[model samples]
Target chain A: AAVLQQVLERTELNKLPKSVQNKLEKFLADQQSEIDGLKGRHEKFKVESEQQYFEIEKRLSHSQERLVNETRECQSLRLELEKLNNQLKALTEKNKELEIAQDRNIAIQSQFTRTKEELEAEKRDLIRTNERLSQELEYLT
Target chain B: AVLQQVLERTELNKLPKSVQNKLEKFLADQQSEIDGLKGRHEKFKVESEQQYFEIEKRLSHSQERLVNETRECQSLRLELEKLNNQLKALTEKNKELEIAQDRNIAIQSQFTRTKEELEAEKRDLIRTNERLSQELEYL
Candidate 1:
């Protein structure tokens, strides 16, 4: 215990001469100022790092939102394409049916034309036979 | 060894080590976090590009299909128009046939009546001639 006290007294700055104590105080003050400057620099560094992290996080969030919107838009476009294809299929089928109807109509039109010509020829023959019968009846009278 | 031990126990070495360790840890953690952010950003960019290309391909394919369908529809419409005109002509022909049929019925009826009247006239003429011949023979 006595040796510990002697060591403490020997190392204590207050126990030194006045001029030495003053020099020690100036040194301590300079060291403290440097430490405070270092601490302030570290605090600023931490603040800057946090701000950078926040900025990057915000940027990622924006990108994610954009990606989701684009995906939904793509999906909607695909669905529209599907609907258009279906409509086209239906139109093709309807056109085929119309073509068939057109063919049948052409056949019927040709038949009607032939029948009309035949009927005209038959009417002419009947007219010629009636005229001959009338002349014979007139001669007998 | 004793001087080295004393230096190790001094506040000078202890404070500097603590500050340096803290700063190193902070800088390293920040670098790691930044690296993670960059990786995620790169992944997002790659995925976005892939989706964009896929959408573009689909859009082109759809455009081609629509153009084909439009062309087909136009041709069908033109054919339908032609068919409608044909139907109109057929209807006109049918109407003409119906009118001719009515005229045929009228002509046949007139011919039958005229023939019957001429036959009666011929029969009367023949009877009158026979009477006149009998009178001449008696004279």
Candidate 2:
């Protein structure tokens, strides 16, 4: 434990409230109790940490397990995430493809519509042209 | 009150076949439920307006609504276009809104999915901020 745990040095006399001063005094007094609690907690924690360390140390001792287990978890997660990503990518690609297909369909429909319009226009033009040609033929005859 | 308000229902009887069917359903289902809620409130009011006032006193205020409505109006302003000068202007307008709504939904879903990401970032920043604040206090 660090000897200087917390130190507040405020020069401005008026700045520190009476309540704050009281709180600080209480805190200073309570420090010993706090230290005892912390000491006990630290002791328990040290024991638990050592136990855990040994358990992990045992696992690390096995070279095959160290190599396999280290990467397997990461790989498993990566694979699961990759599968989900691929599904999303595939969906996105499908959406793009659907949009493209819709565009093609719309284009074809528009082309058919324009062709029908032009055909109607051309048919009228042909009728007019044929009449004009008939008039000319009669004039020539 | 029922007789006076349900004049709309009587009027619905005189409406065209399509309008009559729609109005009948609307009046029977939605209107009755709405009336029920309101009627219950009025009944409660008759019993004790004091209790209602006490309830009103507990009401909390939020600004999320007013700002959201303003944004909706601003967005709807883009919907205002002249009719039928160009080819399929109405279809174009409707389709544009459909596309806009689709994009909005997509963005909203993205935000929802990335909520954890934003939370993680915020939490990290808050932890750092608190730690730094404690450090400064110690200094």
Clashing pairs in model 2?
A: none
C-alpha RMSD over true interface residues, each candidate: 14.0, 48.2
CAPRI tier for the interface of model 1: incorrect
Task: Go through the candidates in order and give the C-alpha RMSD of each one to the true structure.
Answer: 14.7, 50.6
TM-score of chain A of each: 0.71, 0.37
The prediction achieving the highest lDDT against the true structure is: 1
What class would a CAPRI assessor give candidate 2's docking?
Answer: incorrect
DockQ for all models, in order? 0.03, 0.00
Error of 1 at A116 (Å): 0.5
Taking the true A–B contacts (Cα pairs closer than 8 Å), what share appears in each candidate? 0.00, 0.00
iRMSD value for model 1: 14.0
Kindly list the per-residue Cα lDDT of model 1 for residues A1-141, writing each as its tens digit. Answer: 232232224445234445533433443344445555555655665576556556655555555565555556555655655565565566556555655655555665566556556655655555555555555555655
Could you give candidate 2's per-residue lDDT for residues A1-141 as a string of tens digits? 111123332432124444433443453344445545555655665576556555544543453343445445445555555555555555556456556655655565566556556555655555555556556555655
Off by over 4 Å in 2: A1-78, A135-141, B1-139
Which residues of candidate 1, in runs, are more than 4 Å off?
A: A1-34, B1-139
